[PDB]
């Protein structure tokens, strides 16, 4: 089955562009000494809460690029598929991934992050479940509550962003600019989640959906690219 | 003539990479008057000259980057269209590229000199006022950078066209970042001026890597 092929190709890189890139940010955490402390070996999945969705584009567009500019995507195009049927295939392999980053939000990562500062003896993130009905008297913790419910939803939007401008503007270009555009739309989540939190907290009179807007502006762009050119 | 062919075009892309770089560092500082003013006690309507005439904190740091990466990008366009190797296979040697790089570096090293001495205290003494040994010697190893990276980027402009442009210009941008980050860690630290040889090793690498095909074994 070739629906078990595009999904295998994306899942080949989305681990490979993750393990290279988390451990790139793992080896930069030899800053606490500035020697037997495995503090960076113990706080690996704390980055994967946030250092994952910018790799959910660079990697869903890196690896899908070498599926497309080898003149292959325009063969499945010309052999019966629709443009929607290939869009259904990345969402067939997004559901083993949005659940995988849902797991580290409750089970894995804050369990070790609880004992992160405790092991190195000589936004108050706890979970989704325990943080629910923790903020009963609102505030900034109500925002980072509501930011953390559908922070895993952004990974499913991300592979729809990566597939958006692989059919539109960016297809007849060399492999180098697929990483720079594949990282400049990934770097921009730093400068977007870290302002529109404090924007809505200060100015935004709808104080609840201030975190939905970064994962909303990368959906208006995706609906413009595949519904205007053709 | 052929020197005029380069410097009318690298300066046509010097300014284009300048304004996209002067704008990308406002949105890492204008964040820090909203993401830090609610967190680290900085007032609100002082930003009009704090972000306005705070630019020599950053414009002393991007003119050696914009002259470097302006020249690197416009040689990558010049190799991959094979316009170098009809010019290289005529009589003129590699020295036309190196002689051109110094001329376009004067138009930056003058700007990096006037900024670092005259437009510095125009904000540090006429805008540091509110209106509402510890020597640094970092200003000489920043003017000297401008006549140094341009001397070594013209041999590091190959594109080897089976590999792409962005991978070809990877060991240049990544080698500039190594040089331009020792020179902050060796500014905060305390054997100061021992970093002058760090300035001199990559000047010797600027000579070693520039002539590496004219010489025999």
């Amino acid at each position: 089955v070739l629906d078990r092929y595009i999904g295998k190709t994306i899942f080949t890189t989305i681990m490979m562009t993750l393990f290279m890139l988390v451990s790139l940010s793992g080896i930069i955490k030899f800053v606490d000494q500035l020697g037997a402390g495995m503090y960076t070996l113990l706080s690996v999945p704390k980055d994967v809460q946030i250092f994952f969705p910018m790799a959910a584009l660079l990697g869903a567009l890196l690896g899908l690029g070498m599926l497309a500019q080898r003149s292959e995507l325009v063969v499945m195009q010309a052999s019966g598929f629709t443009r929607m049927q290939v869009a259904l295939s990345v969402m067939k392999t997004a559901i083993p991934l949005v659940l995988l980053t849902m797991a580290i939000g409750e089970w894995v990562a804050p369990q070790g992050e609880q004992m992160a500062r405790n092991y190195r003896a000589q936004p108050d993130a706890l979970s989704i479940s325990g943080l629910h009905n923790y903020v009963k008297y609102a505030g900034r913790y109500q925002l980072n509550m509501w930011s953390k419910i559908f922070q895993p939803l952004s990974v499913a939007v991300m592979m729809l962003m990566a597939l958006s401008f692989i059919f539109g503007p960016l297809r007849s270009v060399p492999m180098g600019v697929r990483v720079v555009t594949g990282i400049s739309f990934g770097f921009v989540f730093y400068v977007l989640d870290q302002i529109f939190g404090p924007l809505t907290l200060v100015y935004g009179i709808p104080p609840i959906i201030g975190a939905l807007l970064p994962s909303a502006s990368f959906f208006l762009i995706s609906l413009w690219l595949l519904m205007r050119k053709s | 003539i052929i020197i005029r062919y380069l410097v009318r075009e690298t300066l046509k892309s010097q300014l284009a990479i300048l304004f996209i770089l002067l704008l990308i560092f406002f949105c890492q500082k204008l964040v820090r008057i909203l993401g830090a003013a609610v967190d680290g006690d900085i007032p609100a309507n002082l930003v009009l000259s704090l972000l306005g005439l705070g630019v020599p904190e950053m414009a002393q740091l991007i003119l050696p980057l914009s002259l470097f990466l302006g020249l690197l990008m416009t040689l990558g366009k010049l190799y991959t269209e094979s316009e170098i190797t009809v010019m290289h296979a005529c009589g003129l040697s590699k020295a036309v590229l190196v002689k051109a790089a110094m001329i376009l570096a004067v138009f930056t090293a003058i700007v990096a000199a006037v900024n670092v001495m005259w437009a510095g205290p125009w904000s540090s003494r006429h805008q540091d006022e509110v209106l509402a040994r510890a020597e640094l010697n970092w200003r000489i190893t920043l003017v000297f950078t401008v006549f140094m990276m341009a001397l070594m980027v013209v041999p590091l402009s190959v594109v080897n066209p089976r590999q792409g442009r962005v991978l070809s210009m990877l060991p240049a941008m990544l080698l500039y970042l190594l040089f331009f980050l020792i020179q902050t860690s060796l500014k905060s630290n305390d054997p100061t001026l021992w970093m002058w040889t760090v300035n001199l090793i990559y000047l010797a690498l600027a000579i070693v890597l520039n002539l590496w095909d004219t010489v025999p074994v």
Partner: peptide, 24 residues
């Protein structure tokens, strides 16, 4: 590629990547 070009961008990048952590 080359025998050295896939060996410079590993070592020299690692010297960049550890050096960010000195002044982080």
């Amino acid at each position: 590629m080359s025998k050295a070009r896939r060996w410079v961008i590993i070592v020299l990048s690692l010297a960049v990547l550890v050096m960010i952590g000195i002044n982080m």
